Structure formats: C-alpha cells, structure tokens
Amino acid sequence: NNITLNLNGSEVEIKKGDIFEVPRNNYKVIAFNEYFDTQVDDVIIARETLNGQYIKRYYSHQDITELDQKIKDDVKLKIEEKNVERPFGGKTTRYSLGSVFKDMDFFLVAFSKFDRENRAQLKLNEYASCMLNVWNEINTLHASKEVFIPLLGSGITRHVDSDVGVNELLHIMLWTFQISKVKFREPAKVTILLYKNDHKKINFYKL
C-alpha cells in the first residue's frame, strides 16, 4: 500500500521501495552511528545494516580512507567528545546525535549510540531528539530536492528503555516532522520508504 499524508500543506509520502533505487536527482538518508564508523567487519559495523550495505556498495577500502578524512574535516559536525576508548577499534570522535554529513546525494546520519560492546542503542527520548535534529538538517539542506528516508530505528537499533513498535517509530518520525515544520514553514518533500514485509506491518488506516 502507498499513501501520501497532507500535513497542513506539507505532503509526506509513505510507500514501499528501495533506498538504493532512487534516481540520482534526489537525496537519500542512511543511518550511521555517533562516530560515523566505516569499518564493516561485522564487529563494529554489520554488513546487514544500511550503514554496512551503503559502504560496501559504493566504497572500496582505499576510498573509505578519503571518506574518513572528509567527515573529520567537516567543521559543521558538532563534536560531543574526543579521544574516546574503543576497545575493539573504531573512530574516537563522538558527534551529536542527528548530525548529518553530506556525501554527494546521500545524507549520512549520526543516528545511534555505541557502547563498549559496539551495541547500537537509543533511549526513546534520544531517538525523538535525534529525529528532531535529522529533520532540522534535512529542512536546511534539501534545496528543493526530494528527500528519501528509511524507517529509522526499525533495524538492529536497540531501544533500551521502551517496547516501541515499528508503527510507533513511524509515528515519532511524523510527530517530530510536524514539530520541525514550525521552524521551517517550507519543509522538504520527504518520502519514507518501507522495505519488504515492513510494508504490511504498518497500519495505513491509522496513518
């Protein structure tokens, strides 16, 4: 099923699709972690995540070195902490949740937190506040292009202080989008893509 929600003049469309099949004339969101980690060894970053699929599909190992340098050099990324201890490897600079690094037509999001076991996790309020910063970045950077975003949080992300369901993750995305709209009266045209069986789990009647 495909739907288009008119949110007081701003249309958000929810439909089935593949984030990697969107034409190049559009922006695509991919959730990274609070370190923008790029090591896809199934230890730090897992190849099953979009974070992992994106790096393996578009980046050779020597290209990853340049990507790490461009992120490090992006002065707009707000730093929360430096010289953090990663016991199994990984980058040592932690960024604010919801920070967006622009990688050509892709918006790479500092989405989830990592502990010393490299377990991606968010408290519910951290998830809500992260999405707020994501819409803030998206509404700033869209430049009249359309933005495609997956159902952020509905993957391996551990929601450690709630029993939130995928339908509720979608509702939090729409609520924080409506909050962000108040600041950006002309927001981006956003499309939320559902993947495979996740399209059936969403109740479009309530949506």
Ligand X SMILES: Nc1ncnc2c1ncn2[C@@H]1O[C@H](COP(=O)(O)OP(=O)(O)OC[C@H]2O[C@@H](n3cnc(C[C@H](N)C(=O)O)c3)[C@H](O)[C@@H]2O)[C@@H](O)[C@H]1O
Binding positions for ligand X, rule: CB under 6 A: 18-20, 31-33, 44-46, 49-52, 111-112, 118-120, 150-157, 193, 195, 198
Q: Which does 178 bind (CB under 5 to 8 A by kind): ligand X, a second copy, none?
A: a second copy
Q: For 191, which DSSP code?
A: E
Look up residue 57 and give its two tokens: 């599909």
90, 114 Cβ separation under 8 angstroms? yes
199: which 2 tokens? 């399209």
The minimum distance between CB 68 and ligand X, in angstroms, equals 15
Tokens linked to 206: 């309530």
Closest CB 75 distance from ligand X, rounded Å: 22
| Nearer Cβ to a second copy (4/162) | 162
**Contact (Cβ atoms closer than 8 angstroms) between residue 77 and residue 101:** yes
Residue 96 interacts with, from a second copy, ligand X, none (CB under 5-8 Å by kind): none
Could you tell me the smallest distance in angstroms from the CB atom of residue 57 to ligand X? 10
Whether 78 contacts 95, CB under 8 Å: yes
Alpha helix positions (H), the chain: 50-58, 61-73, 124-141, 166-183, 198-201
Instruction: Say which entry of a second copy, ligand X, none residue 39 contacts (CB below 5 to 8 A, set by partner kind).
Output: none
**Residues at the interface with a second copy (CB under 8 A):** 124-125, 128-129, 132-133, 136, 161-162, 164, 168, 171-172, 175-176, 178-180, 182-183
Tell which residues of the chain come right before a gap with C–N over 2.5 A.
none
Residue type (1 letter), 150:
P
Amino acid at 23: P
Q: Report what 5 binds from a second copy, ligand X, none; CB cut-off 5-8 Å by kind.
A: none
Considering beta carbons, is residue 56 or 119 the nearer one to ligand X?
A: 119
